[PDB]
Each structure stands twice: as C-alpha cells, then as structure tokens.
Design a protein around this nucleic acid. Structure first.
Length: 337
RNA sequence: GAUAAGGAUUGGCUCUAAGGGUCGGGUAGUGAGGGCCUUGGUCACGGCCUUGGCUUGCUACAAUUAACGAUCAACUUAGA
C-alpha cells in the first residue's frame, strides 16, 4: 500500500510536477510564477523567476534545461549551470493568445503545448531553429497610426530586459474548445494525441501538422495519458470518470469531481494513477473498474472540501507518487509493491 | 448671433471653474540584458557544458520659462 513518506511545503498553490527520465530532483510549478527544484529533502535547489502569471505546466528537458508555461502566453526555456542557483531564461516562446495549460517534450528535441486558445503549439527545444519575432517591429517599421498610449503600453512589456523571443514551428488548430492536454506518442514521436473541452480526442500528424482522426466523447476531457505497452489511451473527463480508448470500451469510476491529472506506473504495466479536484488520488488497474488504493492528503490543517485539490500527480520510478494541488504541501507516497 | 469692426494687413483688455486624450528632457561612471566574435571538451554544417569585448537599471554635474515639442482623435458658412 502507498504509505506517506515525506511532504514539503510551498508558498502558494502547486499546479504542475515533473521528475524527468533519470534523476532525483522534483520540479514544481507554482501559482506565483516561480519554478522550484527540490532534492528529495525539502530544500529548494534551483529557482526560476520571471513568469508574469501563475505557472500551469513544467517539463524536464535536460540536466540544465527546463521549459515552463503559465497564464501569460509565453513558454520559457530555462538554462542552468552545471546554496541556491538562480536559473536564467534561455528563451521566450510566443503566440498563443490564451493561457497555456500543458506541455510535453519528445526525444527529437520538440515540444507540444496545449492552451485555452483551442489550438496547439509545435515548438523546438533548440531556439536557433525558429523564426525570431520582434516586438518593436509591429509599432516601429510601419508606424502608421499607433498612438502614444499604445506605444507606452507596448514598451512597458519589455521592462525585464531584452529576452530572446521565438515563434512556433507550427500551429495545430482543429479543436473548437480549449485544449487541456497534449502528449507525444510514446513510440512514434510523430503522433500527438490531445484532449480538449469540445468532447474530443484528436490525433495529429506532426509532419504535416494536421488532425488525422477524431473521437467524440460524451463529456469534456481534462487529462490524457498513454499506455503504449498495452496500446490504450486513458482520458480522465469532467464527468468524474476515465475512459479507455483504442487508438487505431471500459471506464474507471470512483472519483467525485473533475479528474485533472493522470500518470502511469513505470514498473507495472497495468497500473495508472489519477488525481482529481476532490482531494484524493487513486491507483487503478486497467483490467478492473474500481480503485485498488485511494490516497488522501495527510495534513491536519487541510479541509476536505474547502482547500483540498490535486492539480498535479506524478509516477516517479525512484521515489513513488508525487501529489500537489490546492494545499501548498507536495506529498510523497511510497507506491512500491 | 455675445465678445471693437466686418473689404481688409484681424491679431483685440485685467482678474476669475473647465477648454478632447496621450507621450516625451541632457552629459558622465558602473551594473544587467541582446547582437557580432572567439576559445576547449563533448555527442553524427547541428546540439550539449565551459572560456575573454541596441534596450534598461543605480550613482555624480547641468536644465527646471517642458511658458517647449510630438502623436492620436474630432470639426465645418444662421441666415430668411
């Protein structure tokens, strides 16, 4: 049974989590716009500051590279050096027009971003491979009828230095409602299953940047995970259940609110974890239809319905199950046989 | 119709609410960010980790008659 191992606090809500492929550090995105790296002891190792709004997604690119997204429509690539280290923004990535809520990173140095502008961004880890965008050029080269107030408003957006800005490699635009999550294919690295609020699961041809196949669900979808080793797609919906789809059936029920995040057990082939806005994480066997363990938040000051939500859950193969949400604490559960 | 006239060169008193909106000021020193460079190890021209040289911040003297300038947006003959 997954037992409570350790828990360390934050200043504000935690919205995202990541551990990376092989490492011990925990990456957390918070609602203050600060990205924090932990060393399994509750001590902050690296801080990333500069996002205007709350962070909604963080991902691990390399030992010295991170990518983060937030309410401001800017992906930020962070580069560190290898007490407390302060990372520097390697690049800013623009063009979503609505807050970005999910990111994923592939093997071939590519990024997929899902935002509430019912569109998906196809981005590159290497910023030298993208067209640069000049914020000055909009108001300076034509300079047709831009007022002084508009010019000052535009200038006030560049007070935090002159940081590099890049344009997306492509815009995957077929959804009709905000997109909640997008993931790479665990094998192909060219297939881009995503879920949105328009009741659909869409698969994408990243080479041609178009939608290939669309499946319609009865309720809006909030989280998507892939089980390529047994070829299924688990989509947790706002209807408090997880639907299993065959990307070429069964539904898991028991949650009492929006299912926000999903993850898959790295050592077991049939086990996946789900976090929901009711404050409980649940581990599920694909062959069954009922939760086998239900983790709850271990805190004396937490209230079940007042401030208790799970915005991020992660299956880390070296430390267990990482949960984070409305309570500032980041919770670790054993989840090892 | 106010404002001294209405073929001419129209500009017209003192004090006293408002008179469309907005923006903008120097010379020097040092911190920051970008750009061109370049130097090593590393992975099949391209990455990864490292080395030395237009925007903005902080201080020191002039200007404070910016009583200036710039831009956006409005407007036409009340005479029978």
């Amino acid at each position: 049974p997954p037992s409570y191992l350790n828990s360390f606090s934050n200043e504000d809500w935690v919205s995202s989590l990541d551990v990376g492929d092989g490492s011990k550090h925990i990456i957390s995105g918070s609602y203050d716009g600060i990205v924090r790296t932990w060393d399994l002891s509750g001590n902050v190792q690296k801080q990333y500051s500069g996002h205007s709004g709350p962070i909604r997604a963080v991902k691990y690119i390399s030992n010295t590279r991170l990518v983060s997204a937030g309410n401001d429509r800017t992906l930020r690539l962070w580069k560190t050096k290898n007490n407390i280290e302060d990372g520097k923004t390697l690049a800013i990535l623009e063009g979503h027009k609505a807050p970005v809520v999910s990111i994923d990173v592939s093997d071939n140095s590519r990024i997929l971003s899902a935002s509430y502008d019912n569109s998906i961004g196809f981005w590159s880890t290497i910023y030298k491979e993208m067209t640069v965008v000049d914020p000055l050029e909009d108001i300076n080269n034509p300079n047709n009828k831009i007022s002084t107030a508009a010019r000052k408003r535009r200038k006030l957006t560049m007070k935090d230095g002159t940081i590099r800005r890049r344009a997306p490699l492509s815009l995957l635009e077929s959804h009709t409602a905000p997109v909640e999550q997008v993931i790479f294919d665990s094998t192909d690295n060219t297939v881009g299953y995503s879920v949105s609020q328009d009741h659909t699961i869409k698969t994408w041809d990243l080479v041609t940047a178009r939608c290939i196949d669309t499946r319609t669900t009865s309720y809006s979808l909030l989280s998507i995970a892939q089980l390529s080793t047994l070829n299924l797609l688990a989509c947790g919906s706002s209807a408090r259940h997880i639907t299993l789809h065959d990307p070429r059936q069964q539904q898991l029920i028991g949650h009492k609110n929006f299912v926000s995040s999903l993850d898959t057990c790295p050592e077991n082939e049939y086990i996946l974890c789900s976090g929901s806005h009711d404050g409980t994480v649940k581990v599920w066997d694909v062959r069954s239809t009922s939760p086998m363990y239900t983790i709850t938040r271990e805190d004396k000051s937490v209230q079940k319905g007042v401030n208790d939500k799970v915005f991020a859950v992660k299956w880390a193969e070296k430390v267990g199950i990482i949960s984070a949400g409305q309570d500032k604490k980041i919770q670790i559960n054993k989840a090892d046989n």
